[PDB]
Amino acid sequence: SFSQAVSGLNAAATNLDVIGNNIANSATYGFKSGTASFADMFAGSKVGLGV
Amino acid sequence: KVAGITQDFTDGTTTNTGRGLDVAISQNGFFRLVDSNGSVFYSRNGQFKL
Incomplete structure (x- = not known):
């Protein structure tokens, strides 16, 4: 119920x-921009559990 | 005199439990079980395990 x-x-x-971290660090020198990568979570049943 | 106890063989509902090792029959039929003596039995409760 609350897990989704x-x-x-x-x-x-x-x-x-x-x-927000990229927006802050847009002025420094050796910085590389990051992104998140998610993936869903499943039990043995058919409905999902979140992310 | 009581002649006998007679059982009603209509189907119930189908509760979903989400487990892996369980089955449920939807029409006429019975699972066949064998005990340790050798005598056979017939059933409808569908909770199995290892």
């Missing part, structure tokens, strides 16, 4: 923070 929702919230928080 709190995992999506925790994923979108890190996706916002890795954008």
Whole structure:
């Protein structure tokens, strides 16, 4: 019930923070831009559990 | 005098449990089970394990 929702919230928080970090560090020298990579989570049943 | 106890053989519902080793029959039939003595039995409860 809450597993589909709190995992999506925790994923979108890190996706916002890795954008804010690039926006902050856009002026330094040896910086490389990062992106998140997610993947879904499944049990042995057919419905999903989040991300 | 009580002549006998007679059982109603209509089907129930189909509860979904999401487990792996379980089956449920939807029409007429019975699973055949063999005990340790050798005598055979017939059943409808579908919880199996190893």
